[PDB]
Design an enzyme around this catalytic site. Structure first.
Site, PDB file in Angstrom:
ATOM      1  N   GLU B 204      52.944  61.332 -73.754  1.00 16.86           N
ATOM      2  CA  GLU B 204      53.892  60.388 -74.383  1.00 16.86           C
ATOM      3  C   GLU B 204      55.192  60.146 -73.608  1.00 16.86           C
ATOM      4  OE1 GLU B 204      54.415  61.177 -78.573  1.00 16.86           O
ATOM      5  OE2 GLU B 204      52.272  61.214 -78.976  1.00 16.86           O
ATOM      6  N   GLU B 383      45.496  62.810 -79.795  1.00  9.61           N
ATOM      7  CA  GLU B 383      46.236  63.199 -81.010  1.00  9.61           C
ATOM      8  C   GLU B 383      45.943  62.254 -82.139  1.00  9.61           C
ATOM      9  OE1 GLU B 383      50.525  63.790 -80.673  1.00  9.61           O
ATOM     10  OE2 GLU B 383      50.326  64.910 -78.785  1.00  9.61           O
TER      11      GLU B 383
END
Lengths: 485, 485, 487, 487
Positions: B204, B383
């Site tokens: 991220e 995720e």
């Protein structure tokens, strides 16, 4: 870890009327309850939901699937009933003086059983045999219950009685029902004793008389509001239990008990302890003192034909009832126990179920130990569960109550099993299908069963005979913050 | 049944900073994040929760328990990172012209690796080896990630930068960080390649630059509000990814990817389809077009040192973002996606999590198929999960999202695994411990792990490589009626 | 600004049983309703709340204070009833020329001599007290609509416990034409005594609820709570002919207008395919009744009765909320989760806020009801009830302004509507629900009997003194914001 | 009845930045606050709402309408500010005898000649407009408290974006003694121009919030949003000496009372073991400030400054809610879930209802604050702010009556409290939160600028015209029922 005795069994309970129908060929139109929930006037009044039991989960045809799932879940005990109306859909010849208040004896012998035999529906008898054999073959210990509410229409026409007409079949208001129930119960034990492990005569007789003739907004048959008739019904059902106990014992050596609706009575303030005792007298002890110690009020006497007619107590428990002292006596309080808003919190801040019943697992410990200390008869927790379609609360509900049973055993109470209400969703009486109590969800369109996460949790418990370390956190109150208030 | 390919793996992801600390001996005080969450001023401002990561779930010492549970759950893949600061807690000798904007090459060879070797903490290196060996021994396929946010304090002093002082270690604002990250990643691959199955450079990076320098209310370091510096950070992290890819590829033949924070952009009305496209450009395609096709803006050019630096895409997905067309362009709307009230419903009537994130599993199908159609690189869902301490929504969340991955594969997208965030609760950055994402609950007092019912559900999925018939009903929205609004 | 005609009146409605008792000396133990709410079995069943009307707001004794507040609030009309039981607490002589086995009561002869005989049996203290109340009322400049009947029957006409029990040998209320005959006489008699004080008359309040809840909706705990489609029809048949006989009765002694007050709901289609369902519901719940007492059309076979035809001068519209219907194979059904079938203090399935009673906010329904009546019959109307159970006063300011606006809208469309009477001035005893449902513009402290102005009362005063929704309160013509309320 | 002294005044407070703009010609683009809320980066970060003050309620142009409504409501006092920026939109000459490196500003000499010089630089259109507003105000019989400062500084004194960015080379606001020196001059100058219209003066509104939120509570999106304990202390040090210098300034040109308005919270103990924690919180949040400007006690080492001592005639109490504290090893902490740290439209951890802003209902705290001030200092007070964010008007009727009662209680206990000023007359721009937080007795439609009377306004009119909580509204002296509200 909370480990249970090696002999303790985990399983489930279900009722004939609630679970049997749903598969074509299963329809049983011959009960007071069937007529009651189809009644146009009852439906327009909202006394019944308008849902119909023939659209049910279909245990009659799908029992092998039910049992398959129960076996996979590691369950080792089941309590079910036979439906009277299925075995005897047609009136039996008048037998007996119907004007006598007491039924002290009902003579049943081999010849009388053979005669009854000729009236019995053999298809229904063979089907039940098939269900129960399949049950036993999964290693399930079998508690057979004789009565879980519906009466043959030939013994009770509930609409007539609702209308205030007492010239017809009047159900528990008539000693004829007492006499025939004794005979029915002896007859069933006679036919099924090779399959049965323990017997119960009846399920929640206190609710039959209480809701039938006082709590009339509950939409229970015959919905005739009368303190006097409620008393008469209960007097008859008590006698019926004793006569059914003698009946079964004439054909069987196996344990015979009864299953009762309990609540844990709790004091509003510390000045209400006596009010709890009065509540316990009025809702529990009066009834069990009758069938155990023969003590009854007709004037307050001891009936020898009632005394000692019980081997074990089936405890059905869901929630508490909070009481307070009054000048006249005591009252129960709304906002607690079974009198809460649905999907909310109680006045104590405890979460409530889809049915508006308050989360209170301590009550189960209270009930089990109270029964044990008064009578020293062994017990089964014959019902405990929650209306919870979403499965939000059930994992906590299940683990917490099971822990309380461990607590009871630890304090010395003889409790031999825990039977969850219920394995699958079913027809919730006047409420219909919307109250979903199953460890398994039922899609009523297809009769398919699904495992709610709680069923996976129960499998952990049942296969280990313990609340395991890994699920011990579920012995707590469902967090209320994320839930509706 | 929804059956996955025989090669598809179910598992989980976790981060070093979020999960490692909690057991004595595990403390790593040497990151920008550690300093950031201990900062007195940040705590008084409410930018950080005041919870501290050293009171965490303790994976550093308790990893065998984590892995034991993962194995019991039938999991077959794990993604973890090494913490840079643990391996190099002390500054490395200045290497390289720091005023040049582009880092097109970082020369790394065997001798340079041997030199780096002398600076590395061997205790930390041996401990990680022990963790990863224990991981492999459970049959878990291993995705090693190089970076999941914290930087060595010697590369970033976030309080200095927050204060507007740029004379110190400036993290992603400095090409020195780019140069050292390339070297770090090559070095780790060099040490661990025998244990690793696939690599990701970073996790991220869009959130590092986005929240660090624009979304400053999120309390992410260095919390310096600047469009210009946010752009510079992202430019550097892109370069860092490419140089880390070359670095690892110099020592390893194994797949190297990246893990990115995605949202599914959805139109408010049918007149907002173009606004969705602009949002997808601005939040997704600009970044991946850089590292796949070398297309970047510095003027809009093609950089050969950036082109083709990606083998696979790690999709992190939680919820949607609803957008509408503006005169100037497009805006995201509050009341949907990640901008909702906690434990409530969105403006669309969909339940929100403990974090206020909207339930929207379709978004995952949208994201997976969009990536697939543009680039045709294989993916892992790296995720997906929900902040849900009570476990009310998670069973539905898990089953529904897993179904959407099945949907994606069915439409032709190459997706090779699903890794739930996360196996156990952990430290949720600026939010602290209150956001609990674990399939297993952590008691932070004892570090004991518990199985939430969702973990039992995930075990069903993982051991069968399918959403089984029995849990298929969970492929639906959590019923909102019983939940808080 | 939404301005009303100069002749338009704002006021309130109130019932004798719900508001009279509470002060020393006011007790009236002689109705079916009184016995019904005191009944041990009804209480244990939860059919009635356990609250008792004798602990009420005390209008019998405190009427001057009520009227003082109403005058301060600028109100200009009131509708009230006399309680039958208070005037004739003991049975009257079995009457002349009356055959109890006949289905129809086409005529009830009442003359001056008969009235003077009736006068011998009437309670003079009650008669004088009511005169004193009504005189005080008129002295505040309130135009007076006197209603003859608002539910409780004298016990000598109806023992509801006996009937609940399925025993039809005693006084059977609206199941007996004796009640029809006596109501005619009673109504003529009250008009004879009070006509100098009365401006307009209503025979009855919400007769459809008396028969509907009494004999079908038995969970509502309305007397006699005996479940029977057949007896509900019989009760309703008798109440209709009782209304017609009471109209003739009043007209024999007075020239003033005589109407009726009815419980209305706005029937709304679930989907655009249910418009016919609405029509059927309107037939079954409204038109069948009014077609009988206006056009003489009734089912006994479908006939026209000349003794029923034309027995109505005006329509009292009682309106609270909607009912949503859908088409069925058999016909139509009402849906739960809308209208009066919602959760309390929540939101309906349409996202509209619900009251303390679980009734859905739907002011448009009032425009629907008023215009539908107007278009069918062209009889002028009064909105004789409209209000909300709302102790906190969260929703009432919006409820009031919005519904008053809908009356403006109806008048604008051409409907002849001459007043709006809020239910109610003060909190009162809400039947089987007891005191917990609080409908008052004024809050009642039942311990002291003190009245308090809820902010809605200040809003109503603005409306009434201006004969308009003024510019300053016009924003209240909207739905209560639901975000800050319970869901 | 709760009756107030004959001299007691009910009214309202309002701020220039929050209420002035909205009408054509009213724009004031020249403050730190204006630039702050327009800033692209602040908007993208969500530090500010994206609403813009120039779309506001338009008091600049519509003041006559505001005053009309206030007069109708029976209000008798107003507190308002002049915006510094509107009077001096351009920089003034670097001043005489001023050393910017000195920590203390003990004296600022201002004489008639200096005032006449200042007058050359002042915007005459703004000066005349304010005269017109204030004259209209006085003509309605409103007693006038003029406040000099309510947060926005002229941009030439503070560029908040530069400072947010960590650049301290430009105009630095309360971080610079130049601002202290200029505020003194500004305050003396305004008093010099308007003293014929003013009844009493306040130097500043909520200075603790300027320094607290500006430099510590940075998530609040207050300028310059630069996180620094050290700079918060410096800002607060300067604001204190600015207040003292402004007091001397005003006093040089006027004999009238000069006070200050401060942001108060009632500190409450979590458990009975936290009474000391309350004391420490009261020291850290209230007494340290007032001990400086009354007793001259300050920390620079703990000293007494003679130039600070005695610079206060009266205390303006701004009160909204409580703060609950508990004892710590290190000292004390405030707890979330109570006071101003609750969920919006919900209930606190104590079960008390919260506002649109998430502020907890706690009227007792006002009695606490008023009596604590009285007992320490014996300076008379005004409640200069008290109100609630409540667009629906669900809670405000209770909020208003309950807090007004607590002032009655304080006076009864002997505290000298001379007025109550609701925040606010009409909805306005709530700082970083924008228009969504609606505090008005009157609702503003921001499209038309029309004002509407929320029912609470009718309740306030009852209070003000009677100088009492009357018997009829006394029930509102209670907690809003929580059952029908959101939890």
């Amino acid at each position: 870890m909370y480990s249970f005795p090696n002999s303790f069994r985990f399983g489930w309970s279900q009722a004939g009327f609630q679970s049997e129908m749903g598969t074509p060929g299963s329809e049983d139109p011959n009960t007071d309850w069937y007529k009651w929930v189809h009644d146009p006037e009852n439906m327009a009044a909202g006394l019944v939901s308008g849902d119909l039991p023939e659209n049910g989960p279909g245990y009659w045809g799908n029992y092998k699937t039910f049992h398959d799932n129960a076996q996979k879940m590691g369950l080792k005990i089941a309590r079910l009933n036979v439906e009277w109306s299925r075995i005897f859909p047609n009136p039996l010849p008048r037998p007996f003086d119907e004007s006598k208040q007491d039924v002290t004896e009902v003579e049943i012998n081999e010849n009388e059983l053979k005669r009854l035999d000729e009236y019995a529906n053999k298809d229904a008898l063979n089907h039940y045999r098939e269900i129960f054999k399949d049950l036993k073959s999964r290693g399930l210990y079998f508690i057979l219950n004789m009565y879980h509410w519906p009466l043959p229409l030939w013994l009770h026409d509930p609409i007539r009685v609702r209308r205030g007409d007492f010239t017809g079949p009047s159900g528990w208001l008539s000693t004829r029902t007492v006499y025939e129930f004794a005979r029915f119960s002896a007859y069933i034990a006679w036919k099924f004793d090779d399959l049965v492990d323990e017997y119960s005569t009846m399920n929640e007789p206190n609710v039959v008389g209480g809701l039938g003739y006082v709590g009339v907004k509950s939409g229970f048959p015959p919905g005739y509001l009368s303190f006097e008739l409620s008393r008469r019904a209960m007097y008859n059902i008590i006698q019926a239990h004793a006569r059914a106990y003698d009946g079964i014992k004439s054909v069987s050596k196996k344990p015979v008990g009864i299953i009762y609706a309990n609540s844990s009575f709790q004091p509003l303030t510390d000045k209400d302890m006596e009010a709890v005792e009065m509540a316990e007298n009025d809702n529990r002890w009066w009834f069990f003192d009758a069938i155990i110690r023969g003590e009854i009020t007709r004037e307050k006497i001891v009936r020898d034909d009632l005394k000692g007619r019980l081997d074990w107590i089936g405890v059905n428990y869901y929630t508490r009832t909070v009481v307070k002292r009054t000048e006249k006596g005591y009252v129960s309080l709304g906002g607690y126990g079974h009198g809460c808003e649905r999907n909310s919190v109680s006045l104590a801040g405890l979460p409530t179920s889809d049915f508006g019943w308050e989360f209170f697992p301590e009550g189960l410990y209270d009930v089990l130990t109270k029964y044990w200390n008064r009578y020293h008869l062994y017990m089964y927790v014959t019902e405990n569960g929650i209306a919870d379609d979403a499965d939000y609360q059930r994992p906590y509900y299940l683990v917490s109550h099971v822990y309380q049973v461990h607590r009871a055993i630890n304090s010395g109470a003889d409790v031999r099993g825990y039977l969850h209400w219920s394995l699958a969703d079913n027809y919730e009486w006047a409420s219909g299908f919307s109250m979903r109590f199953g460890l398994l969800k039922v899609d009523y369109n297809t009769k398919r069963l699904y495992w709610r996460p709680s069923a996976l949790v129960y499998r952990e418990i049942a296969t280990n005979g313990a609340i395991t370390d890994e699920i011990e956190h579920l012995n707590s109150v469902p967090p209320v913050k994320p839930l509706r208030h």
